[PDB]
C-alpha cells in the first residue's frame, strides 16, 4: 500500500473498496499534492484498491484528548476503555501513548 498506516482513509463502498489517504503530510507515496481547500494541507493522492489497513494513531477515537498546542500537536487520550486499540503501545483500562500528529477525532460529537 501507498501508506504504512492511515488515520483518514476515504474508501468507496464498492467491491473491492477504492481508498485514498487524506492524512496531512509534510515531507511529501508516489504523488503528493494539496487537499481540497487549503493548498497548505498536503496529502498523498495515491488511491489503493482494497482494505486501507491500520490507523496510525493509538485510538480509534477520543472524547477526552489533552494536547500541546503546536501544529501538529502531541496528544494523549485519557478515555477509559474495556480494551485499547491494536495501535496503542501501552495499555494500562487506559492507553498512555503520546501520539504526535493530528488531534484525534471525537467518539461522541459536540
Amino acid at each position: 500500500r501507498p501508506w504504512k498506516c492511515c488515520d483518514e482513509a476515504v474508501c468507496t463502498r464498492s467491491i473491492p473498496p477504492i481508498c485514498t489517504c487524506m492524512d496531512e503530510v509534510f515531507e511529501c507515496c508516489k504523488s503528493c499534492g494539496p487537499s481540497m481547500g487549503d493548498p497548505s494541507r498536503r496529502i498523498c493522492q495515491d488511491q489503493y484498491v482494497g482494505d486501507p489497513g491500520p490507523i496510525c494513531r493509538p485510538w480509534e477515537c477520543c472524547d477526552k484528548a489533552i494536547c500541546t498546542r503546536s501544529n501538529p500537536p502531541t496528544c494523549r487520550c485519557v478515555d477509559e476503555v474495556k480494551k485499547c486499540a491494536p495501535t496503542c503501545k501501552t495499555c494500562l483500562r487506559v492507553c498512555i501513548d503520546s501520539y504526535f500528529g493530528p488531534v484525534p477525532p471525537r467518539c461522541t460529537p459536540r
Binding site: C11, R13, S14, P17, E60, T108, P109
Partner: protein, 223 residues
C-alpha cells in the same frame, strides 16, 4: 448493510445488482431503460440484474440486461468523490411488474431527520467480512449537514449528505455502493463512501441526488 435486516423478497423492486462476473455494486431503476448508480462503480462492461433477491440462487423473477450506455457525471472526482453519480442505459427495456419497478427522483431535497430506507448486498459486518445472498434493508435518518461535516471535516461537498447513526452499528458498507437511499418514495441518496463501516461518529456519505435531477433528465433526453 451493517446492523440491518433481510428485506422481504422483492419488496425493494427498484433495487438492482451491478454484475461483471460477480456482484460489485448496487443501483436504482429510475426508468424502464435507465439505472442510476455511483460513478466510482464504473466498468466498461456491466450487466444489470433486476428482480433479484438471493444473488447466489436462480429463483425465476430475475432479469439480466446489459448496459448499452454508461455515463459518469462529467464533473466526477475520483479522489474527493464529489459528483459520484452515473447513469446506465439498458440494452433493452426492463419489463415492469410487481417485482421490478422504478423509483421516483426527488421532488425536493430531504430535510434533516427524514427517515429513509437503504438497501444492498454489501458487507454486513463492521469487523471482518460477511457477504449476504439476500438483500439487506436499513431504516436510517438523513443527518444535518452540520454533524456530517463535523464527522468529516473538510470532506463534505454540497453534493454529499450523511445518512445513518452517529453512534455507529448501522450503516451501509462495501458492496452497497451505487445502491439506493429512499425517503418517502423518493431517491435522495446513492451509497458512496465513508470511513470504515458503522463506525462511531462516522456515518455513511451519499451522493445528494436532489442536486442531480436536472443532470439526470437532460442526459436521459439526450440519449
Amino acid at each position: 448493510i451493517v446492523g440491518g435486516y433481510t428485506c422481504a423478497a422483492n419488496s425493494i423492486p427498484y433495487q438492482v445488482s451491478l454484475n461483471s462476473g460477480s456482484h460489485f455494486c448496487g443501483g436504482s431503476l429510475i426508468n424502464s431503460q435507465w439505472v442510476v448508480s455511483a460513478a466510482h462503480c464504473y466498468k466498461s462492461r456491466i450487466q444489470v440484474r433486476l428482480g433479484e433477491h438471493n444473488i447466489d440462487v436462480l429463483e425465476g423473477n430475475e432479469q439480466f440486461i446489459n448496459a448499452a450506455k454508461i455515463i459518469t457525471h462529467p464533473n466526477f472526482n475520483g479522489n474527493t468523490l464529489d459528483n459520484d453519480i452515473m447513469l446506465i442505459k439498458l440494452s433493452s427495456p426492463a419489463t415492469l411488474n410487481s417485482r421490478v419497478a422504478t423509483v421516483s427522483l426527488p421532488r425536493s431535497c430531504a430535510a434533516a431527520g427524514t427517515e429513509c430506507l437503504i438497501s444492498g448486498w454489501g458487507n454486513t459486518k463492521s469487523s471482518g467480512s460477511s457477504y449476504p445472498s439476500l438483500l439487506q434493508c436499513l431504516k436510517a435518518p438523513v443527518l444535518s449537514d452540520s454533524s456530517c461535516k463535523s464527522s468529516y471535516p473538510g470532506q463534505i461537498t454540497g453534493n454529499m449528505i450523511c445518512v445513518g447513526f452517529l453512534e455507529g452499528g448501522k450503516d451501509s458498507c462495501q458492496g452497497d455502493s451505487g445502491g439506493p437511499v429512499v425517503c418517502n418514495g423518493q431517491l435522495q441518496g446513492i451509497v458512496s463512501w465513508g470511513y470504515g463501516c458503522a463506525q462511531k461518529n462516522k456515518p455513511g456519505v451519499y451522493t445528494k441526488v436532489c442536486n442531480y435531477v436536472n443532470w439526470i433528465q437532460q442526459t436521459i433526453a439526450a440519449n
